[PDB]
């Protein structure tokens, strides 16, 4: 039932700064907070968010993650002059103190708890806290790397204590390793920590052996710590997405967290003087979007780093846009991750194979920098149009509508006379397809839609052909059914995904046909193919429209909502779904996911059939030379 997105911010946290010269700490300025909040106001994003006030974290709350000794020492810094503050700062690595930093540290922490309470009390769907000082380097008895208290560690400990969550996922996409977080949950299997980070074979700060891929956690927590070290600078959108499709998401959906907290440091973005990576701000729209179907959307984004004020503003907007549900921007130029990234990726996957299903088949062997300003993102006036069979009034979610103009009806006749003849109620189906498609493609007024149809072949043809004419340069087709369709994948403008019951050997590289064995194992197998095959091809293909098609036959579709939601990362969310036959369940589920609603978790799934994982790896072997984003190992050289 929850709706809205929280934005927790307060200008008080910009009221401490570095007071002596120190080239390591110069980069961390109050303007990081000012610039990010002002960027959100300029784009009308703050105004769309529920402003939740900051509060101070209590002493009891700080002691969840820090020791009395260290809190006591920090509590004396407001009484210190600058000489004493310099001496106290020098006891720690890469941190400076200020008469107001204890105050703001308590606010940055309390802000995070406010966000956790709003989300877990269902007052909002998700949210973001813009805070200073950052947290993820902070440790039980020490400040480190601009961090005083560990805001994100707080949030998970607090969520554990006050809501009795058994499973919390923390995603740390800052460019630095959140070693404070890793230390805090090393032995705790109830918190899964994922972190990518510039490493460079341990030559990059904080220079820690245990920032490497081999630190998987300790004791009962083995396998719930996941480090992906970047060993070269300049990592791109393709590296980040390869990290998500082939490491993070396969683990996250199996973990099935009850809450997601994000250490959202944007020094991993292009232009940052410290990360020196190359991912565009747009990538964060997708990082956010790909995590949103977890935990019924309960996602708390907490700011960490980000030092290029321009890069910083644009990545914060891209994140809030996606929290608010705005359509995701198209990512072009995707391909293989670079070789160093594939090394890191395959090493993490191999070492994690002891602990996670999706990787288990790897163990047995029988199996001034400037860039283009991001485009405006804007919620469609009506997000989803729906065309149920004639005479079915239905309870539509808040942003939906039902169904034909003279222009349109003229066109259906032209198509009728040239290519078909037919005289039926299909003539209504095809008029609906066209008028829905025209609202999707022509206007930013409507985003996606679902039409119930009866005749499959004619419906598919008119939908596909009318789309290529608008023109939609490329169309991704996702078809759950058997047989072949009036779809030609020979010119490179169409890619066909087919989920079917009979195993049919496909030849060329513009078709991905998945035939999974029947039974209780089918749900886990579908999610593996979705995350590790379908999504990487689709993102590289970068279609302008997605056309979904479901045969009346298949029943076993507890997964359709997850794909509908993930697949809206492509084509700015422009997806038309054709449902063959009526099924109030499937139609209400499709419309709900299309409309941006919360998706219900999958929970525990029976791990997939070896015959299923083998068939999928046969598809990856067959397609990954054309679609490099499918690769999760370094390629063999001649
Ligand atoms: C490289 N630069 C010219 C100066 C410099 C800053 N630091 C500390 C630091 C801590 C944390 C974060 C962060 O954003 N974490 O998420 C960013 C920076 C250093 C440490 C060792 C050597 C040099 C430097
Ligand atoms: K990180
Ligand atoms: K853990
Ligand atoms: Zn950082």
Identify residues after which the chain is interrupted (C–N over 2.5 A): 367, 403, 420, 554
From the list 66, 136, 137, 246, the catalytic residue is 137
Task: Write out the two tokens for 458.
Answer: 């004619």
The CA distance from 173 to 441, in Å, is 34
- DSSP codes, 315-340: HHHHHHHHHTTPPPPP--S--PPPHH
Q: CA nearest 496: which of 185, 485, 586?
A: 485
How are beta strands 225-230 and 191-198 bridged, if at all?
parallel
Ligand 1 atom 3: the closest Cα is on which residue? Answer: 24
Q: CA nearest 243: which of 194, 181, 191?
A: 194
Other CB atoms within a 10 A radius of the CB of residue 454 amount to 16
Ligand 1 atom 5: the closest Cα is on which residue? Answer: 24
Best of 27, 95, 150, 311 for a ligand 1 pocket test (most atoms within 8 Å of beta carbon): 27
Q: How far is the CA of 277 from the centre of ligand 1 (A)?
A: 15
Q: What are phi and psi of 379, to 5 degrees?
A: -65, 135
Q: CA nearest 312: which of 518, 33, 555?
A: 33
Give yes or no for a contact between 356 and 223, defined as CB atoms under 8 angstroms apart. yes
Angle at 462 between CA 466 and CA 390, to 5 degrees: 115
Q: How was this structure determined?
A: X-ray
Q: How far is the CA of 156 from the centre of ligand 4 (A)?
A: 20
Q: Would you give the distance in Å from CA 144 to the centre of its chain? A: 28
CA distances in angstroms from 570 to 33, 457, 534, 583, 632, listed in the order given: 31, 25, 12, 26, 21
Ligand 1 atom 4: the closest Cα is on which residue? Answer: 24
The CA distance from 116 to 109, in Å, is 11
Helix (H) or strand (E) holding 260: strand 259-264
Q: How far is the CA of 158 from the centre of ligand 3 (A)?
A: 15
Q: CA nearest 599: which of 288, 293, 326, 327?
A: 293
Best of 18, 22, 24, 142 for a ligand 1 pocket test (most atoms within 8 Å of beta carbon): 24
The CA distance from 534 to 529, in Å, is 6
- The resolution, in Å, is 2.4
* Active-site residue, 246 included: no
The CA distance from 244 to 229, in Å, is 14
- DSSP codes, 469-511: HTT-S-EEEEEESSS--S---SSSSEEEEEEESS-----STTE
Helix (H) or strand (E) holding 192: strand 191-198
Task: Write out the two tokens for 618.
Answer: 């046969």
Give every CB contact of residue 321 below 8 A, 6+ residues apart in sequence.
45, 285, 377
Other CB atoms within a 10 A radius of the CB of residue 505 amount to 7
Q: Helix, strand or coil for residue 529? A: helix
Give every CB contact of residue 275 below 8 A, 6+ residues apart in sequence.
175, 198, 233, 267, 268, 269
- DSSP codes, 193-226: EEEEEE-TTTTSTT--GGGSTT----GGGTTSEE
Best of 94, 96, 148 for a ligand 1 pocket test (most atoms within 8 Å of beta carbon): 94
Strands of the sheet with 168-172, listed across from one edge: 50-51, 5-8, 126-129, 299-303, 259-264, 168-172, 191-198, 225-230
- Find tokens 């009318």 and name the residue: 466
**Counting ligands in written order, which one lies closest to the CA of residue 218?**
3
Q: Which atom of ligand 1 is nearest to the CA of 265?
A: 16
Ligand 1 atom 1: the closest Cα is on which residue? Answer: 274
Q: How far is the CA of 267 from the centre of ligand 2 (A)?
A: 10
Ligand 1 atom 24: the closest Cα is on which residue? Answer: 24
Q: Helix, strand or coil for residue 548? A: strand
Helix (H) or strand (E) holding 547: strand 545-550
Looking at residue 57, the DSSP 8-state letter turns out to be P
Biggest CA pair distance of the chain = 90
Q: Helix, strand or coil for residue 172? A: strand
**Counting ligands in written order, which one lies closest to the CA of residue 145?**
1
Ligand 1 atom 6: the closest Cα is on which residue? Answer: 24
Q: What are phi and psi of 147, to 5 degrees?
A: -95, 135
Q: How far is the CA of 194 from the centre of ligand 3 (A)?
A: 9
Q: How far is the CA of 302 from the centre of ligand 4 (A)?
A: 13
Angle at 203 between CA 197 and CA 205, to 5 degrees: 55
For ligand 1, residues with CB inside 6 Å are 23-24, 94, 134, 137, 145-146, 174, 176, 205, 265, 267, 274, 304-305
The CA distance from 536 to 246, in Å, is 9
HEC readout, 419-460: HCCCCCCHHHHHHHHHHHHHHHHHCCCEEEEEEEECCHHHHH
Count of alpha carbons within 13 angstroms of residue 631, beta-carbon side: 22
Q: Hey, which bits of 9-157 come out as E strands?
A: 50-51, 126-129
């Amino acid at each position: 039932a929850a709706s809205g997105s929280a934005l927790i911010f307060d200008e008080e946290m910009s009221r401490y700064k570095l007071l002596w010269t120190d080239p390591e700490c110069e980069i961390e300025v109050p303007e990081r907070l000012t610039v990010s909040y002002e960027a959100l106001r300029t784009h009308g994003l703050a105004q769309r968010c529920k402003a939740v006030p900051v509060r101070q974290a209590t002493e009891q709350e700080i002691l969840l993650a820090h020791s009395e000794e260290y809190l006591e020492a920090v509590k004396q810094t407001p009484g210190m002059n600058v000489e004493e503050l310099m001496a106290f700062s020098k006891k720690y690595n890469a941190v400076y103190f200020h008469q107001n930093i204890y105050h703001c540290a308590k606010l940055a922490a309390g802000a995070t708890l406010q966000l956790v309470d709003s989300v877990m009390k269902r007052e909002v769907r998700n949210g973001m806290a813009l805070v200073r000082p950052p947290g993820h380097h902070s440790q039980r008895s020490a400040a480190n790397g601009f961090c005083v208290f560990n805001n994100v560690a707080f949030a998970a400990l607090y969520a554990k204590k006050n809501y009795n969550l058994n499973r919390i996922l923390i995603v740390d996409w800052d460019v630095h390793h959140g070693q404070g977080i890793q230390y805090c949950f090393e032995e705790d299997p109830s918190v899964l920590y994922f972190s990518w980070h510039r490493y460079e074979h341990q030559s990059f700060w904080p220079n820690l052996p245990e920032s490497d891929y081999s630190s998987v956690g300790k004791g009962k927590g083995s396998g719930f710590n996941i480090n992906l070290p970047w060993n070269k600078v300049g990592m791109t959108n393709s590296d980040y997405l390869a990290a998500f499709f082939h490491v993070l998401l396969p683990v996250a959906y199996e973990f099935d967290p009850e809450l997601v907290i994000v250490s959202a440091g944007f020094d991993s973005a292009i232009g940052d003087p410290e990360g020196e990576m190359c991912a565009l701000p747009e990538i964060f729209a997708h990082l956010t979007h790909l995590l949103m179907p977890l935990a019924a959307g309960k996602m708390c984004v907490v700011l960490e780093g980000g030092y290029n004020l321009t890069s910083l503003g644009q990545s914060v907007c891209q994140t809030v846009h996606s929290l608010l549900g705005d359509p995701t921007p198209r990512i072009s130029g995707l391909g293989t991750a670079c070789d160093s990234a594939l090394e890191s990726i395959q090493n993490v996957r191999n070492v994690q194979s002891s602990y996670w299903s999706s990787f288990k088949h790897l163990a047995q062997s029988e199996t001034d920098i400037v860039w283009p300003e991001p485009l405006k993102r804007m919620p469609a006036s009506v997000r989803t149009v729906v065309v149920p069979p004639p005479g079915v009034e239905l309870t539509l979610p808040k942003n939906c509508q039902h169904s034909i103009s003279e222009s349109t009806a003229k066109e259906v006749q032209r198509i009728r006379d040239k290519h078909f003849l037919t005289d039926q109620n299909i003539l209504r189906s095809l008029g609906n397809i066209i008028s829905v498609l025209d609202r999707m493609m022509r206007s930013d007024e409507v985003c996606n839609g679902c039409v119930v149809v009866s005749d499959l072949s004619v419906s598919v043809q008119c939908a596909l052909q009318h789309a290529l004419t608008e023109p939609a340069e490329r169309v991704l087709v996702v078809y759950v059914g058997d047989g072949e369709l009036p779809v030609k994948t020979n010119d490179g403008k169409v890619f066909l995904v087919q989920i079917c019951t009979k195993e049919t050997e496909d030849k060329c590289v513009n078709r991905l046909t998945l035939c999974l064995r029947e039974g209780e194992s089918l749900t886990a197998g579908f999610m593996q193919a979705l995350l590790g095959l379908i999504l990487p091809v689709a993102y590289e293909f970068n279609p302008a429209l997605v056309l979904g098609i479901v045969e009346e036959t298949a029943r076993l579709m507890r997964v359709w909502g997850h794909m509908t939601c993930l697949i809206q990362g492509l084509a700015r969310g422009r997806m038309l779904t054709l449902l063959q036959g009526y099924d109030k369940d499937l139609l209400e589920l499709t419309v709900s996911a299309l409309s941006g609603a919360s998706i219900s978790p999958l929970g525990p799934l029976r791990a997939p059939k070896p015959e299923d994982v083998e068939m999928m790896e046969k598809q990856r072997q067959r397609l990954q030379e054309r679609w490099g984003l499918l690769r999760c190992t370094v390629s063999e050289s001649w």
